[PDB]
Structure 1
Amino acid sequence: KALSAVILAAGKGTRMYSDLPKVLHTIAGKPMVKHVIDTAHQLGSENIHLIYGHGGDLMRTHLANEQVNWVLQTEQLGTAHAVQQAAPFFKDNENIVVLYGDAPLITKETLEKLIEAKPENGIALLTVNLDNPTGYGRIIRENGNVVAIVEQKDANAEQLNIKEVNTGVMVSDGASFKKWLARVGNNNAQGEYYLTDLIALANQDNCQVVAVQATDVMEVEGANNRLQLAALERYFQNKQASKLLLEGVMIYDPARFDLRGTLEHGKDVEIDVNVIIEGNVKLGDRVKIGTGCVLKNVVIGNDVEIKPYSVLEDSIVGEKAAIGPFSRLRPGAELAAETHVGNFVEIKKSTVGKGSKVNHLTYVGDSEIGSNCNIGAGVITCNYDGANKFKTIIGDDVFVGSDTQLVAPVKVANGATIGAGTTITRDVGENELVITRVAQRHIQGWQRP
């Protein structure tokens, strides 16, 4: 049958000490709630009902493009009340899964298992086994079915030893949710309407509740503060790193690797310690990434080595290129095959043709550079004190001597040669040599201090 999701996301998250609401804090660069939305989508959810409240404005701005039903809860009166806000939108004959925006690690595979276990007109309850279950509601099984969730304060001595505990994550049909949510009271020490009470109500109705255990305890773990969030982060990164390792990526130390987005990789890729991969990154075969590198939204071709402490964003790098160490590629940097970019070099919104080298102490911006060019140490593209900054066009087989300024807009044609220390303002023709004529004063017998 069909499926829709409810995600509880209304919390203030006081103990985060933040201007953000609780579920917008990021794990691997992505709000916690976004992980849960994505998981709900990948399960095949037809609708995703997002129960929100605190930080409403920020929720709407941060998640504006999410395919969710925005259900604004004016007061937090308990989890059952929250789910009930979405209930008018439940189809009677679809399944509904209830998830929490502050528990981002829940997997599709566990949730498929949960949904699969749900008996007709009944409930599948996600449980977890804890070594110290103190404080949590104990699962009571009779004849394979959950007959009660006994809270800490009610449990007898033997019940307290039960390690299996309620997570609050559950699946039932829309009709059953509508029926049972209407029967939830708030007669308890907290005066709240608890979703937990559906298990009792199902049992009252001679409907079956089946427990499904989460394989990994961390999967169902939520974060109430940034210490807990950091723990989820570490768990998440280690899981990501382990997957890549088993796919054949050499990650020198998986404890010092961060992926904040998606990585596409070839074979024999090597990633040294303290690399951060952000956004959408694609690495070809035999790419080597040295220590300290940051790659954000880049495509790297086969056989590229990126040497240590290089930072790349919104860039493309052709096969057999060599980058770094201490290289900076800014958005729109496009390096062709067999190119060389060296230390203390910055390339912004420029194309660099096959075989060209830019190896030291250089800024190239808003430029086209052709094939087999030699861009000397200290070369700088610049503009007049004007408005909008213009383009520098360098053809093929050009030599630009060290510490030369190229003043845009300017064109240097194929095969041109430019002496060291030159200021280029006028276009340079094909096979034109331009050398600066210096005037020097020479003083003999100048004794230094």
Structure 2
Amino acid sequence: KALSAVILAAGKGTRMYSDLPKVLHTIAGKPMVKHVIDTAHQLGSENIHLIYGHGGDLMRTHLANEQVNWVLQTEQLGTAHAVQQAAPFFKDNENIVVLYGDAPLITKETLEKLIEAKPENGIALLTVNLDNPTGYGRIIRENGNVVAIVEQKDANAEQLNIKEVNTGVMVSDGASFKKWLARVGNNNAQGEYYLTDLIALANQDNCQVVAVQATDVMEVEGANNRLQLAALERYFQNKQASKLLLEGVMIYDPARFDLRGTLEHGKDVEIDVNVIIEGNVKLGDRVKIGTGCVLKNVVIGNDVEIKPYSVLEDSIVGEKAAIGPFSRLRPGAELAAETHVGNFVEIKKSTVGKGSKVNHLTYVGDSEIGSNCNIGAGVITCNYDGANKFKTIIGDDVFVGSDTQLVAPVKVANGATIGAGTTITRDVGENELVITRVAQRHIQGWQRPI
């Protein structure tokens, strides 16, 4: 039957010592709560009820495009009170899964298993085994069905040795939630309405509560501070790296690899140590990425080698291209097949045609460069003062001599040759050779001050 989700995301996260609310801190480049929202969507959730409160304006701005129901909680009275804020929107005939915005690593696979196990009119409770369960609510089974969650302070000597504990994640139908949430009381040391009390209330109605164990404890771990957040980050990155390794990506050291988005890859892709992949990246067959590279939102064709300490963003690189080391591709850089970009070169919002080379100490911005061009060392595209970033157009088979300035707007036609040290302000015609006439003074017998 249908499914909807409730995500608790109202927490201040005081121990983060941040102006952000708790769930907006990122794992792998995206907010903890976004991980959970995405997981909820992957499960096929019809509605996603987001319980929010602290940092409300920041939540709204940071998650503006998320397809969620914004349930603004005015006061924090416990998890049961939080869930009950969304209860009026529950369908009687749908399943509801309760999730936590500060526990981001819960997987679709584990939640599918939880939902599957839910008995009619009953509850499916996600549990986990801990080597040291001290502090956590112990799962008491009579059958394989949960009759109680006994808290640390109430447990007898025998119960304290129970390793299986409550995670707080649970599934039940909407009608049952609406029914039981209205019966939850707050007579306890904290004065809070606990969602945990639904296990008791379910048993009061002779409805069975089934336990389902999480595969990894890190799926249910929350982040209360940045040390814990860093632990989740490393676990997540290791898991991502392991998946890629088993898919056939050669990651030289998975402990020194970071994926912050999505990676599409071909076969025989090699990634050296300390590479960061951000946004949506596509790598073709036999792509080799050297140490220290940063790729953000890029498409890299087959057989490309990116040499060390290259930074690429919002760019496209054709097959058999060679980039780096120390290359910078800024947004809008489009390199054709078999191109060459070398050290201390910056390309911004420019197209570079097949076979062309830009190998040293050069800035190319707002330009179109044709096929088989030779852009010499020290070449710079620039503008007049007060300009609006006008374009430099370079044709096919053009030689641009070293340390030449190309002053936009300007066009250099096919087959043109430009001598070293030239300032190009007027258009250059097809097969036109332009060389600078220098005036020099030569003084003989100049003894250096040494």
Give CA deviations for 1:123-173 in whole Å, capped at 9, x if unaligned: 000000011111110000001110000000000000000000001100000
Give CA deviations for 1:281-333 in whole Å, capped at 9, x if unaligned: 00000000000000000000000000000000000000000000000000000
The residue aligned with 2:298 is 298
Length, aligned pairs only: 449
Give CA deviations for 1:20-64 in whole Å, capped at 9, x if unaligned: 000000000000000000000000000000000000000000000
SS in 2 for 1:218: helix
Give CA deviations for 1:162-193 in whole Å, capped at 9, x if unaligned: 00000110000000000000000000000000
Give CA deviations for 1:39-92 in whole Å, capped at 9, x if unaligned: 000000000000000000000000000000000000010000000000000000
The residue aligned with 1:22 is 22
- Displacement of 1:214: 0.3
Give CA deviations for 1:350-377 in whole Å, capped at 9, x if unaligned: 0000000000000000000000000000
SS in 2 for 1:39: helix
Residues in 2 aligned to 1:355 and 1:173: alpha-carbon distance in whole angstroms: 63
Residues in 2 aligned to 1:276 and 1:141: alpha-carbon distance in whole angstroms: 46
SS in 1 for 2:345: strand
Residues in 1 aligned to 2:22 and 2:260: alpha-carbon distance in whole angstroms: 20
- Displacement of 1:389: 1.2
The residue aligned with 1:35 is 35
SS in 2 for 1:15: helix
Give CA deviations for 1:210-258 in whole Å, capped at 9, x if unaligned: 0000011111111000000000000000000000000000000000000
Show the 5 A alignment for 1:430-449: 430-449=430-449
Residues in 2 aligned to 1:335 and 1:301: alpha-carbon distance in whole angstroms: 10
SS in 1 for 2:86: helix
Residues in 1 aligned to 2:218 and 2:88: alpha-carbon distance in whole angstroms: 32
Residues in 1 aligned to 2:366 and 2:144: alpha-carbon distance in whole angstroms: 69
Residues in 1 aligned to 2:260 and 2:371: alpha-carbon distance in whole angstroms: 34
Residues in 2 aligned to 1:144 and 1:23: alpha-carbon distance in whole angstroms: 34
Segments of 5+ residues of structure 1 without an aligned counterpart are none
SS in 1 for 2:359: strand
Give CA deviations for 1:332-363 in whole Å, capped at 9, x if unaligned: 00000000000000000000000000000000
Residues in 2 aligned to 1:93 and 1:392: alpha-carbon distance in whole angstroms: 64
- Displacement of 1:386: 1.5
The residue aligned with 1:183 is 183
SS in 2 for 1:446: coil
SS in 2 for 1:135: coil
- Displacement of 1:100: 0.1
Residues in 2 aligned to 1:166 and 1:104: alpha-carbon distance in whole angstroms: 17
Residues in 1 aligned to 2:55 and 2:426: alpha-carbon distance in whole angstroms: 56
SS in 2 for 1:170: strand
SS in 1 for 2:112: helix
Residues in 1 aligned to 2:11 and 2:374: alpha-carbon distance in whole angstroms: 58
The 4+ residue runs of structure 1 with deviation greater than 3 A are none
The residue aligned with 1:352 is 352
SS in 1 for 2:85: helix
- Displacement of 1:16: 0.2
SS in 2 for 1:243: helix
**TM-score, L = length of structure 1:** 1.00
Segments of 5+ residues of structure 2 without an aligned counterpart are none
SS in 2 for 1:236: helix
SS in 2 for 1:396: coil
- Displacement of 1:415: 0.2
Residues in 2 aligned to 1:274 and 1:79: alpha-carbon distance in whole angstroms: 41
The residue aligned with 2:132 is 132
Residues in 1 aligned to 2:342 and 2:143: alpha-carbon distance in whole angstroms: 70
The residue aligned with 2:12 is 12
SS in 1 for 2:227: helix
Give CA deviations for 1:369-395 in whole Å, capped at 9, x if unaligned: 000000000000000001311000000
| Percent identical | 100
Residues in 1 aligned to 2:144 and 2:35: alpha-carbon distance in whole angstroms: 32
Asked whether 1:287 is paired with 2:301, we answer no
Aligned residues: CA RMSD: 0.3
SS in 2 for 1:116: helix
Residues in 2 aligned to 1:153 and 1:297: alpha-carbon distance in whole angstroms: 51
Give CA deviations for 1:93-122 in whole Å, capped at 9, x if unaligned: 100000000001000000000000000100
Residues in 1 aligned to 2:70 and 2:151: alpha-carbon distance in whole angstroms: 32
SS in 1 for 2:314: strand
Residues in 2 aligned to 1:55 and 1:70: alpha-carbon distance in whole angstroms: 13
- Displacement of 1:426: 0.2
Residues in 2 aligned to 1:255 and 1:165: alpha-carbon distance in whole angstroms: 30
